[model samples]
Target chain A: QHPDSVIYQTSLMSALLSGVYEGETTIADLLAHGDFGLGTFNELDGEMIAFSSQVYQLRADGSARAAKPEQKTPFAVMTWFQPQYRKTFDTPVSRQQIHDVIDQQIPSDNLFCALRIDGNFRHAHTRTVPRQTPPYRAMTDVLDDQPVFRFNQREGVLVGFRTPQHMQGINVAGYHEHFITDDRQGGGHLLDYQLESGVLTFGEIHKLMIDLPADSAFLQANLHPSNLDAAIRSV
Target chain B: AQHPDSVIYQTSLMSALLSGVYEGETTIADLLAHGDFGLGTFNELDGEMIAFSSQVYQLRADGSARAAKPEQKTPFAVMTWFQPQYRKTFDTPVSRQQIHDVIDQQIPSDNLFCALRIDGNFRHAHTRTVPRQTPPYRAMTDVLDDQPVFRFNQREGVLVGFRTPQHMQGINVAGYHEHFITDDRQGGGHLLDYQLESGVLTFGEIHKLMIDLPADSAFLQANLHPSNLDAAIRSVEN
Candidate 1:
């Protein structure tokens, strides 16, 4: 994995975790419940490091539409990937290089459409561009080289990530897993699913957000787990 | 003229004799030579009626592709009823088969389209009789009561009868005149000429016919006429 890709993914995950529950929940609660604890870092001299920063928050919102007519607050996660390296090794990777690999493996014009109804997830590869526009055009332009995820009210709670070649082949073989943990005041929930092997998992998290309500606002702040002890004591 | 013997003699005898005598060789030249033939009349001494018949004429054709084509041959004769007193009734009513046979004798199936009827007032008319089994069948009988009732065979001249208020110059008596001419070879063929006391003398013709040629023969051709020369020149210059 490219160091830049790993850093980019880590920065996004940190932004998402900090932004999603800035005022609603604490980092300690997230660390206790969600998968955001320190783990062995391969690039950092095998030193222990927090997994929270490794996550990325492509976009988030306040309200989402629900099947019952009433709405539910929801958030989404979009992770950059390199499918080519999924079967060979485990390490941080560059998203751009991985995207290029995936693009080479698939037709140039093809895209994937994913739908998650409640807990069940289904996806189909298509040549059509998805209707959702990028959440922050300026940010995306700045990070133009990277495949940025888009979020919008019309898209419900769904967020899509471009797949890498390695992940495309092995992720479906039960080697990788994806989940969403919501920590909103009344909307905390966890979604977990695995893609099948060899099948192209083009679109992800498409239907899961269909019934979620849009959020009113969101905030972000980053903190190292070692610094969290002092921060918790001060609070 | 309502007498049964007179009617039989005028209608059945005259028609039978005319048909039998000229069964195989009737043409335009024979009819032209008769010079005003009268029906139901004969010179007692000569034992012959001053009756006109027809004959066929043949024209030699050049071998060139653009040589003038032979004129179409028509089989029917145009007989006139000169006066109101010249009324004849047949023993049997006219049938569609009889009309079909007469029409078929003149027009080739490949070139024929349909038939039309013209009234004395020169209006298009309708008919109650249904068409025959063969295609391109039509009947225009709506103007049956017109002063000059006409029956048009496909590609042939009209058979007409004139009535009251319509007569030839100096001839106050009623009469029928047979007008025979070839179908309009140049297109724009007029079927009727009429005069009104308060209006213009007008002439009307059949609408243009469309010919669909095979793919190999299809070509764009100019439709140049005196009335359209200005527009044609403008298009060509552009």
Candidate 2:
């Protein structure tokens, strides 16, 4: 793929479901493969966003800062995030409206896509998983107590991926979106957003790479769950 | 991947199917001269045939695998001289699935096309054939729903197949499409699965594809775009 779209950290999704939420991979390690991505830090720490080749952390207290050198990660999806196609919306639009407009230019569903929306947002609804401890439950359970954030008339960029229905459990089937402000102050897992005006860009990813933790916590855990589809779809 | 270091060649299966123009661009006799092993269907979907050293075997839906008659024409077929990219001999016998499982391990890239040829004593081999269809044929799935499969215990045989990228959906069988040809030239068709009691596997790499399109006026004028190519291909091919 020559530095194209790939997940540096994988199978952690199953570990996430198995309640093995300890940390191993790092912002530094993931960035070496791709400069762009978003996920929580080790032990499911505050949201970790990698943009412009730098790692930033948005804590549960709603404060944003660069992740520390000591910071590590448990689970994250990453890619080089280079947009092969670019367009602009002169008029304001809703989330669904953006989908329709992009639908007009989407190449095909068979190929993976990375979408990056820059400029300002009139409003954005987002969420973040707070730090967790040893006696962990499934991701659906952890998300039950997850926090949500609302940004009013803010300036930020949206980071996300669009996958096919065929890739259901192997990856986030649809859009796994996240948000961060241009001011580098706040953002988290995106719930919804309204674009005041922005330049929307997307890239077609042709290949995928995955690296697993391979630690005892991951290797020893049962990756399959009874409600795997529901558990994966949850939160 | 058994022959991880060989080359692959193919004809444009989609162009022939989409234009409804399977007018036998190449002859079975000519193709066999070039490839000692291969598989494909007859023009106008007459029957499924496999070519090898001894003779070509035609497997019709209404019948079992039999020695094909000479002079039959073909719309689409792929053939390759087997060469191994990585040469390895197994002291221990392996299952058919295990052969494929290890095949997955040897492919180096996701985008390029591939060729695999395995030769050895095969205790068991299985194949399937779809009946012929007339003009204005329905999509492939309808014909495949009534398809028939057969199992044979071929003594010494060769397996020929290709690995195509998903992007080549309509142009060819997208994933692993394989065929079989025994030394006796009695068994072949689209190979569903097989039990390779003991065998030597080889591989090849294909960098380019060449399609000798039919030069008929109808072929030149007919439009060649079908909407459900992915569905049609997946339904019939494994």
Candidate 3:
């Protein structure tokens, strides 16, 4: 959530986190709160993955690119991943099916979890769009703005979470999942998946803080004043 | 009559609610400026709050009702201008599900937003008021152990709230969530479950969502994004 609380919780870091960014928090500052997380570089350049305390600005597109201290992201959510439990389910499972299986087992819904699973995927519905040139519309409207590249017989780890529905605006819905091929050649915001077998592990969070764009456009884009749900979905 | 985008507003994040972050960021007088009709709670989980017809009521722990003071502060709440885009009156008794199912079919689309107002007699109704908690706040489920559930039958009352899509999760309750108030202004809280004997239903198709955040240190410094937030939303809401 952005711009700090009371005045804004779902309202912070507006442009960057909501596919709208120009001026926002820094990687140095953002990563301080959490050792591992994900975001994008300036101008929607590439995916920013902070693994092992080093922010790697790789696209997961096979090529490994470490991000500099300068790349500010449009949308980002990061937390030091520390798992309290781990489980690996055998036999192929749909994204929805595995989610159901995990839901019943997770002890608490209020806590945040960092998830990583590796295995053969029967289906990986993934995508990364072309950089946006916006009148600054909703995510849905910006759909034509990018690319969708799903893979079959793919092998990799599915990165995501089972968040609270009420936290919709604060983070991705019940699921803010994404995927990366074992080859490290592809991945992005996940739409669907079918896994052969993935070892899953996670940890709950202790502290979570968010910041927003200080710029006026992000602060008051006046975007979707009446239809934020619809607008955000489009983006 | 007013700007469409100016109708609805929220006080804090759903994350804050589940975290037991009940510190007050705005007063009753301040909240009223956002919208005359809304719902929230008093400082320290003092009671269940219902904003209706320009007055905010507190449904306290011991089954009592009182008007909230102007100085009373709220941890979380949502409100909007009471403007109806559609209206209907059903003569037959109906379960709460039946009413909602009908609305689902009638709405132009689920992607858009809407507000509701039901005026009628209920065959049965149920609700719960949150108990107060201190700084050693625990998970909402544990804290909610002290909550008191109230039930009544054959009551004359009105229920109001919003119908949002799945994507609007932490902002407000995703589906139909409402609060009840009697004609005599006697008793009410978050509407848990209810069956309508016969009543008139009116809706405001919200075209905009107005949000007002408090400008203060307590709010600015607090961690609104707790991982256990979803846990609290799960236990606290209907």
Best by lDDT: 2
* Fnat (0 to 1) per candidate: 0.00, 0.00, 0.05
Between 1 and 3, whose TM-score is larger?
A: 3
Location of the lowest summed lDDT over 10 successive residues in candidate 2 chain A: A3-12
Which candidate ranks first by DockQ, i.e. highest? Answer: 3
DockQ for all candidate structures vs. native: 0.00, 0.02, 0.05
lDDT of 3 by residue, A10-121 (tens): 1232234455645456777666556666655555555655544666654524344556776666566666566667778777778877776566555445445566676888
Sort order, TM-score high to low: 2, 3, 1
Candidate ranking under DockQ, highest first, comes to 3, 2, 1
Worst 10 residues of 1 chain A by lDDT: A205-214
Which candidate's TM-score is highest? 2
Error of 2 at A152 (Å): 1.7
Q: Please, what is the TM-score per model? A: 0.15, 0.60, 0.53
| Model 2 alpha-carbon drift over 4 Å, by segment | A1-9, A12-15, A18-25, A68-72, A216-226, B1-120, B129-141, B144-147, B157-238
